[PDB]
């Protein structure tokens, strides 16, 4: 209803919180994903989502899944998001059992990039797990659900015991757990009772498979220090020996597509369409409301990047 700015297609994952519906932006012809939140189901965590959405308006990175449009009806919230055909990182591992060191490295370098960018913008994800890591058609990673139950396995020990934590030192712990599951295909700390799970995280002791290389084991033990003072810093991680073991350059965390100025061709096409001049069109865009204009601009930008003509129907 009312979001007939879009033709609706397939359903690609329902949660008891938010469902995702596939869609097509009428004007641009561009494929999109729609996260459908129900305000009734949220309730005591609506500002949780509003703050999540407000962070997501200020993040423009190649490994962050792009927000196009927010739409809030009487009872529903619609997030219009970058289309990620490739699927989830979680489902990518379970199908390969585990990834090669060389492939984990390729993927890991992308997580580091997305996460470093986020930090530089003065945010921490505070939930890095393979269920938040989507793949595009070019098999590049995109980061989702910035939100902050079964994230207890990926939780930092100082986060567990309600101590004073830094959001980056936590993000580093999470990336250690993720690095483990990438190479092994199972969790380093895992238990049926959640108290014994909490015990193993504090103990800091974990299994090491025979297939793990020494540099791997060594990076893992740098990353899964219980004491946050002892954990590897984000700064030291970008140019780490292991990280640079195949592609001998540090992580390119800097946004490769910054929001700088508005694109000329997009502004001219929106001016002809919305039947007003360049300046009145530019002012209207620069307001960045995450309405249909923001979606049309950002999706015309997408169309331009593909080498398709910068035109609405
Ligand atoms: O576009 C998304 N996923 C997607 C799109 C197409 C297909 C899939 C996932 C998986 N089956 C093949 C087709 C997507 C993007 C963002 C998001 F938060 C949730 C889902």
Write the layout of secondary structure elements.
Elements lengths: L5 E9 L3 E8 L5 E8 H4 L3 H11 L10 E6 L3 E7 L4 E2 H8 L4 H20 L12 E3 L5 E3 L13 H4 L6 H18 L9 H10 L10 H10 L10 H5 L25 H10 L4 H9 L5 H14 L8
Antiparallel strand pairs: 1-2, 2-3, 3-5, 4-5, 6-7, 7-8
This protein binds 4-fluoro-N-(1,2,3,4-tetrahydroisoquinolin-7-yl)benzamide.
The site of 4-fluoro-N-(1,2,3,4-tetrahydroisoquinolin-7-yl)benzamide has 13 residues, from strand 2 and strand 3.
Walk me through the structure.
Monomer. Interacts with ZNF622 and PPP1R8. Residues 262-301 are annotated as: UBA-like. Belongs to the protein kinase superfamily. CAMK Ser/Thr protein kinase family. SNF1 subfamily. The chain has 313 residues and is α+β, with helices and mostly antiparallel strands. It has one domain (1-313): Transferase(Phosphotransferase), domain 1 (Orthogonal Bundle). The chain contains 12 helices and 8 strands. The strands form 2 sheets. It has a 5-stranded antiparallel beta sheet. Helix 4 runs antiparallel to helix 6. The chain is globular and about 65 Å long. The two termini are 22 Å apart.
């Amino acid at each position: 209803e009312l979001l007939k700015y879009y033709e609706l297609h397939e359903t690609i994952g329902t949660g008891g919180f938010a469902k995702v519906k596939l869609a097509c932006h009428i004007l641009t012809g561009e494929m999109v994903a729609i996260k459908i939140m129900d305000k009734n189901t949220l309730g005591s965590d609506l500002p949780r989502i509003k703050t999540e959405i407000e962070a997501l308006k200020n993040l423009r990175h190649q490994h962050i899944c792009q927000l196009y449009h927010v739409l809030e009806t009487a009872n529903k919230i619609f997030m219009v998001l970058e289309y990620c055909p490739g699927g989830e990182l979680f489902d990518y591992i379970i199908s390969q059992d585990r990834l090669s060191e060389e492939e984990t490295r390729v993927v890991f370098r992308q997580i580091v990039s997305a996460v470093a960018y986020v930090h530089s913008q003065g945010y921490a994800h505070r939930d890095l797990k393979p269920e938040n890591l989507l793949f595009d058609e070019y098999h590049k990673l995109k980061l989702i659900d910035f939100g902050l139950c079964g994230s207890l396995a990926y939780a930092a020990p100082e986060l567990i015991q309600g101590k004073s934590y830094l959001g980056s030192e936590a993000d580093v712990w999470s990336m250690g757990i993720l690095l483990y599951v990438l190479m092994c295909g199972f969790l380093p700390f895992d238990d049926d009772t959640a108290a014994a799970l909490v015990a193993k995280i504090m103990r800091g002791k974990y299994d090491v498979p025979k297939w793990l290389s020494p540099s791997s084991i060594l990076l893992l033990q740098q990353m899964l220090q219980v004491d946050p003072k002892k954990r590897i810093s984000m700064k030291n991680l970008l140019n780490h020996p292991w990280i640079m073991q195949d592609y001998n350059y540090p992580v390119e965390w800097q946004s490769k597509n910054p929001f700088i100025h508005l694109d000329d061709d997009c502004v001219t096409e929106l001016s002809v369409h919305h039947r007003n001049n360049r300046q009145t069109m530019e002012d209207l865009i620069s307001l960045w409301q995450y309405d249909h204009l923001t979606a049309t601009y950002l999706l015309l930008l997408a169309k331009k990047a593909r080498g398709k003509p910068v035109r609405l129907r």
